[PDB]
Symmetry: D2
């Protein structure tokens, strides 16, 4: 039983075994749309969910099934469901759970396209959402209504890597009859296990650390079998249609083999870079859970096995400085994703949020000098030199 081995052993083996018919060690790429039955009877036995086996890849596929099983084991969940994207993991989940008249309490400090879905799309389906500062569990409690079905959080959260106390929030949600859904993208199961802290459902964008190689868009949902069966057979099948391609599942299986050693190196690197930035007189602030001045440092130590691979920081001199800095890096690459093997950097005030009113960005935690860094697998000395050179230039 794969649930019995060590976590690195599970990373490598859980959900997978040699192909029964051939012995192939790699999980085969079942790049098929349909599946053949031996008889009328076998076709019937599968459709009524009266007998196990495959029918059609939108419903289930052996390659994707391996990925779902592996991630269920890694998050200590019953079952997994792969999706087309991180967005689809979130929306499949919430659209399965909620209907007209229901309510959601959401953290404000969440991924931007998640916020758009919650702010604009949900209310158009009759589903109301209240946003709160989830670093303050009391605001979550105060926002709960009789109609609240879900509490939704991300931790750590952009853009300043603030935290949410999963265990505390889970207790509050459950006392009030709601489910807790946690987006665990930033951490991966190697660094944080929300189900073990009382969350009901975990979602990821596997696009970030789980795949890790910057070449797959995808999501995963993990939770109880009863829920996952609804997310599969109603949410995905009927509502979003957000299935993962078998090739993408295979790539993610391949990427996740190195999850443990990648996370160790990302976090070792990031701690070094965060300490460098904290010592730098041109840098006003450094946001990183591994720094002891982080305002929720102790919580982070309890909840996270490592402080993560992402750092935010503020450069002296505001917008122009941030722009000059990101324009002066030679090694770090300018891009908006994270969790890849390459170090990526972005300056949201000049890049993504450049048309947004400067005062709105500030309300949103986005100061003019804020830079976000996804630390890769390069030598940290080279990343530090590159940052040092660019900071010197920018200031």
């Amino acid at each position: 039983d794969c649930r019995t081995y060590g976590f690195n052993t599970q990373i490598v083996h859980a959900g997978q075994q040699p192909d029964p018919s051939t012995g192939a060690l790699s999980t085969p790429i079942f790049q098929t749309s349909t599946f053949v039955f031996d008889s009328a009877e076998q076709g019937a036995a599968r459709f009524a969910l009266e007998e196990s086996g495959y029918i059609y890849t939108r419903l289930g596929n052996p390659t994707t099934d391996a990925l779902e099983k592996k991630l269920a084991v890694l998050e200590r969940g019953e079952a997994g469901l792969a999706t087309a994207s991180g967005i689809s993991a979130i929306t499949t989940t919430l659209l399965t759970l909620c209907q007209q008249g229901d309510h959601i309490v959401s953290a404000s400090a969440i991924y931007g396209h998640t916020h758009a879905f919650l702010s604009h799309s949900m209310p158009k389906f009759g589903i109301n959402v209240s946003f709160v500062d989830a670093a303050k569990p009391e605001e979550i409690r105060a926002a709960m209504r009789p109609e609240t079905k879900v509490v939704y959080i991300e931790t750590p959260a952009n853009p300043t890597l603030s935290l949410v106390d999963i265990e505390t929030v889970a207790g509050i949600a459950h006392q009030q009859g709601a489910l807790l859904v946690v987006d665990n993208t930033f951490m991966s199961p190697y660094c944080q296990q929300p189900l073990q802290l009382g969350a009901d459902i975990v979602v990821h964008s596997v696009t970030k650390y789980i795949n890790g190689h910057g070449d797959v868009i995808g999501g995963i949902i993990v939770g109880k079998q009863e829920f996952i069966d609804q997310a599969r057979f109603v949410g995905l099948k009927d509502i979003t249609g957000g299935c993962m391609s078998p090739f993408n599942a295979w790539l993610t299986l391949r990427g996740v083999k190195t999850l443990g050693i990648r996370m160790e190196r990302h976090c070792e690197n990031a701690l070094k870079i965060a300490r460098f930035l904290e010592g730098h007189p041109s840098i006003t602030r450094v946001y990183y859970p591994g720094l002891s001045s982080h305002p929720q440092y102790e919580l982070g130590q309890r909840q996270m096995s490592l402080p993560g691979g992402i750092i935010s920081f503020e450069i002296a001199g505001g917008l122009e400085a941030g722009r000059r800095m990101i324009n002066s890096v030679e090694l770090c690459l300018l891009a908006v994703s994270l969790g890849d093997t390459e170090t990526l950097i972005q300056h949201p005030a000049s890049m993504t949020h450049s048309p947004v009113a400067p005062e709105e960005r500030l309300k949103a935690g986005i100061t003019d000098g804020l830079i976000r860094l996804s630390v890769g697998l390069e030598d940290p000395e080279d990343i530090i030199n590159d940052l040092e050179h660019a900071i010197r230039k920018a200031t």
Copy 2:
């Protein structure tokens, strides 16, 4: 301009050209999650939709863009949007268009998972749906309400390959202020062009004939640029997350190269097989638009350039006969998809709809002896011999 060449030339070339940097003839597989910017300024220029280029594959990708452009040309539409599945093409479309309080008029004779989405999921978002017999355009008119945003049809329709008069229905929908959405999966653009008949939006499951090779789940939406931009930047980005993987897009580009020659052969084969079945004294009925006894035969001749690759038929002796028949084929393969290079066969009363009450199936057009056949690229004589042998055995 690719919109100027013949249709076979467009099938091969539209949306594609040699790679500019290398000359590679095959469209490269851009199996990437993110895209790098040259500067802060270039990153900003893309996000505000102020300058063209790529950002992130959930938003857009060069491989997928080629597929979208090709299918837009083939359907004579402005723009295309690829999706994770045929379901996602439909739901992305309808969830973009509709909100709480809106209404849809839908054909009853539609794909089963579409019917589930319309029957069960839409009403839970406050979106009501009226089902009608779309072979009777008057029932569509009578079901229209002030709140009706969309009329939704499939033609030909399962299970008896009845038709819908696209042009007539489009006129009725537009007079009453609604959009017409047509699922053109069964035909492909090679055989039917709903936009040219007044439809506003076409959707496909590319899983069937467009890909054609039984190895891709995917969808596509084609329509006006203004609509497609909303389906991309709200529907997909925010709501369903149903993006297509670049690999799947490349496979579908590859599959669609042979669309014209495949459709010609599927339809040539199917006409021969349909005539054989019509002459067979053990077969009570044959449903095929190429047979002159089809009740909408003339409409079909006007609307469709070929009668298609799908045949339904009823075998003497009801359920037991249908089961014995599908259990007695040696060449045809028992499976529930269609539009693959292999001939596929299914007996819905014993396979898919075996737990459904026999009288409900009958209301739904599914008689106990009904067999559905997706005609492949084999020698038709071999398919005929296989059917002949199995029919003889079954009766």
Copy 3:
């Protein structure tokens, strides 16, 4: 037994079946390097070739095995062996068969890199080669020696699509104790079957028509089991190492599904274009086996079921005209391969053979005005218009 069905049925089905463990219809992509054994005993049973099954993909793989079996059926050969390239199919074959002191009789009119291998590499291994005009079977006989192990031919042959009488040459080779190896790349098994005419071994570059989609480099060898086992376990395993990747095998399996309908359309198109060129007063010569003035026309009719998709022709005005013409096409693409879905064109005197002495090219059949055309799946009217426009411009 797949060897019993019609040829189109075999194209679709031979060598393939639904996956036994899952029912997946598409052959799974077994993208693996190794294979696991259940026990020491099972590992031993495979290595001594004492029991069937897989060990390691360089030796054999289930995806590649399907391709090998399919092509063996299509060529009416016992066994198949896939390779990294068409070159590797040829060299694996000849390096398996021949050793220091042996001799080969080869056609002169062969693929250029084949000629280089025969002219320069073989003699450096002590293997001598005599080149002859294989359109004259007597020259083959006259060149035979006691040490001659192989007679090697291509038909049709570049650059003027001359033919070789397979049956006649086979008889001559066998009387003198030699094997006949035929490169059947230009025809595919759909159009010519050298084994049925007495050849011992057929090779292809699957890069051309068998794959057909311009996205795979690969080869195949077909022949008797005893030979193929030597080509696999010595030639490939030890000598060239030229194994095919499972992904490439899967792509070629996918491409070959449409071989019959592609060849029909390539040849229908090519006959139309060849007739157009023959009627054009700016074109001095047209080389195409489907034209009745071809000097071996009747032989072609006996030996080939279709005249093929390749045309060569000579434009009035020599080198400058040929260059102006290829520079003036808008639809045809300038490239050196053939057998793709797109129409490709090349002018060897200005492109490939531009540094070669003009008189050497002439000895080699390459006149200054010679253009080679690989006819694709576009509308022939569009290809004709494009050629017409470019010829008018060039002259």
Copy 4:
């Protein structure tokens, strides 16, 4: 310049950059056979090697070029050449260098299929080979002849992980006018750099650690540009045809991103497991360069940055014990490859070499109790427990 960064930075970045036309961060998969030219002139400019760019994937491809460049940087070589297999890397190399009448001095302790090529195939091309114990550099010197073109070694070598002193052997080979070719498969460039020690040419099977994921068969050659150009344009193009598919190159690029962190973990694990085995009273011998009793331990410390991921050991009780042991593991997988993320185990006397005469195996270093272990990325405690359990059972 990528040759200036740290080695981990080079692992991630060398040979790669964002796509120029699109910014895609992942190297695109250029899964193409041919490449289009803009004009006759551009086609000519490429063929004569008079201008840079692509022509045809057997000759060169942008995806494969990235892999070749990366591995050249990592081995501190001028140029790289990817191949279909490790075998093809070796044979392409040696068949390029050598012709009838030439001689090779080879280590005896080399990969088995290499030994077959050298023992049986080379002499049939007039190329003689002398095998020597390359742990004794004097035997290499004594075997040199006026005709010796190459000295060929592997280090560490199977089956007992003996070493060869690269620097010493290079000096001996060069004094006598020969090239030194080193198979660096077992180490990877992360652990050993033969070019930096005076080797002329390095080869790998990328099937093992460079790819690392058990899903690619492939090779690479690294050396001087003048040599590599001959290996490409004669060896590969003409002789072996052993090109690598672009997909396989992309997979290997992806796999090699984690080379540094994988090697660190493989070797950390292997040292722990080797120490465990050395302390075990049922284990008579343990072969591992990281153990101080290894007979060439100091050499290993100078030549290798880590002691590697492979261990051989001898179990008490000979053949029956070895068989019982490999039949009793539950976590380790029975297979013949190495360098994958999963721990693999084999007992050559019962598996591979079971039909070989027991006394021949002994001459070859293969004792009846010898087990070979490729240590994966699992928790070492789990691998140790699995070995402990199986050893206890076997004895």
